[PDB]
Amino acid sequence: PAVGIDLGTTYSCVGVFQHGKVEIIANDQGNRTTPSYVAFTDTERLIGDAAKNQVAMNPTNTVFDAKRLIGRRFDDAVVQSDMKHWPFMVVNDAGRPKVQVEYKGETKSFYPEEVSSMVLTKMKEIAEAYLGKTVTNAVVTVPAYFNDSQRQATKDAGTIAGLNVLRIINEPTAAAIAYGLDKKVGAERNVLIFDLGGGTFDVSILTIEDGIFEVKSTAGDTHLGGEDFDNRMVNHFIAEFKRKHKKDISENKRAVRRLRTACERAKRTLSSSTQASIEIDSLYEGIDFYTSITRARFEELNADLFRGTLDPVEKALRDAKLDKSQIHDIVLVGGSTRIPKIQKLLQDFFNGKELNKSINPDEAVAYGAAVQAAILSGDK
Numbered sequence: 404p405a406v407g408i409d410l411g412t413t414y415s416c417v418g419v420f421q422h423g424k425v426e427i428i429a430n431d432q433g434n435r436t437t438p439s440y441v442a443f444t445d446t447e448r449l450i451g452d453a454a455k456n457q458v459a460m461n462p463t464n465t466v467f468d469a470k471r472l473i474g475r476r477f478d479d480a481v482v483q484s485d486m487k488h489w490p491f492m493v494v495n496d497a498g499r500p501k502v503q504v505e506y507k508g509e510t511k512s513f514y515p516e517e518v519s520s521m522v523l524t525k526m527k528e529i530a531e532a533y534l535g536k537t538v539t540n541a542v543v544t545v546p547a548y549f550n551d552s553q554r555q556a557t558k559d560a561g562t563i564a565g566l567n568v569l570r571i572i573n574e575p576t577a578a579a580i581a582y583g584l585d586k587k588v589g590a591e592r593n594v595l596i597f598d599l600g601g602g603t604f605d606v607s608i609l610t611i612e613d614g615i616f617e618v619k620s621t622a623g624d625t626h627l628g629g630e631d632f633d634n635r636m637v638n639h640f641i642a643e644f645k646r647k648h649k650k651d652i653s654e655n656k657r658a659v660r661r662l663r664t665a666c667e668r669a670k671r672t673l674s675s676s677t678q679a680s681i682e683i684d685s686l687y688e689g690i691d692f693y694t695s696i697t698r699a700r701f702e703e704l705n706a707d708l709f710r711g712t713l714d715p716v717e718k719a720l721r722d723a724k725l726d727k728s729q730i731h732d733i734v735l736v737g738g739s740t741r742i743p744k745i746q747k748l749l750q751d752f753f754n755g756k757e758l759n760k761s762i763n764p765d766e767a768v769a770y771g772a773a774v775q776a777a778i779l780s781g782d783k
């Protein structure tokens with residue numbers, strides 16, 4: 404049994420094509436996505452939810468955003484810029500970046516592909532827990548703009564995890580494969596992939612013909628994601644708590660974290676409901692924080708970030724030399740594309756054109772990866 408693994412910036416997802424359909428596999432916590440987090444404590448190494456859940460208690464030894472480091476050199480401008488936003492240490496080992504942590508009392512360093520191997524190990528175990536069988540063969544996805552060094556380092560992460568990586572394929576290709584846009588009766592198809600995750604915004608235009616997924620353009624923002632929408636909600640409620648209780652909770656890591664968690668949950672709920680409850684017992688000094696937020700307020704807090712996602716779409720179209728009327732298919736992927744206002748903005752931008760969004764947007768890449776894995780293994 405060959406699996407498809409979406410190794411995302413903030414979440415990872417594993418699917419298997421069996422008996423004519425994709426099954427996206429829930430972890431032992433019942434979650435169909437797993438945080439791309441690894442934590443190092445005085446006793447153990449944690450991966451996924453367990454790692455993310457203890458981040459506020461152990462910030463310096465909790466590693467994330469390994470995908471931003473993978474296949475890069477220490478001196479790279481992107482690495483030096485990104486280090487300013489991480490509580491964990493990034494050190495230079497002979498021109499290569501390593502994350503340095505405390506683990507079982509000792510100072511330890513790990514290459515990005517070692518951190519990612521631990522996430523892939525977790526995704527491997529999630530598939531094996533469900534299938535009741537050893538999982539070796541996998542297709543793993545990377546962004547279209549990833550170079551050979553980034554692709555090789557991602558593949559090596561799989562190998563370190565004991566996975567046989569059949570192929571590294573582009574995330575926008577996986578999304579297009581999921582919706583079967585390569586198997587439509589016709590000539591070429593122009594496809595725009597609108598991919599908004601937790602940390603990154605990726606716009607891709609492919610022209611698909613004779614099984615060739617030609618990248619015509621890429622655009623977006625490597626630092627725009629769902630976490631920015633969460634940030635706007637947290638600042639909103641910190642100001643609110645300040646007004647009501649004359650308490651600034653900003654420098655209480657635990658308090659801010661629990662507010663952030665509640666804010667992300669509320670955001671997810673606002674994609675299906677016009678209102679959401681914030682319910683935190685003893686947020687700060689035993690003071691309960693029970694309030695609500697309307698969809699309207701959430702949209703208002705994030706108005707500039709939401710409509711700003713259309714500028715990269717325009718750029719991608721210009722660089723691809725296509726009018727919006729020449730796009731055959733629009734594909735929503737990444738967890739953030741569930742936000743109704745984002746969906747409305749993109750559909751309005753494409754003058755009413757229906758969006759491909761029937762596949763759970765945060766599962767579509769793993770879905771495509773799993774289809775490709777079955778094809779390569781000869782089980783489809």
Ligand SMILES: Nc1ncnc2c1ncn2[C@@H]1O[C@H](COP(=O)(O)OP(=O)(O)O)[C@@H](O)[C@H]1O
Pocket residue numbers: 410411412413414415436439599600601602603628629630667670671672674736737738739740741742764765
């Ligand atoms: N129903 C939802 N409504 C709004 N945002 C959501 C929803 N489900 C997930 N998200 C957001 O999607 C982001 C994760 O996107 P995903 O593609 O799964 O991860 P990655 O960041 O690794 O690409 C998070 O910010 C999460 O809060």
Ligand SMILES: [Ca+2]
Pocket residue numbers: 602626627628630631
């Ligand atoms: Ca950001």
Ligand SMILES: [Ca+2]
Pocket residue numbers: 411412599600601736737738765
């Ligand atoms: Ca994603």
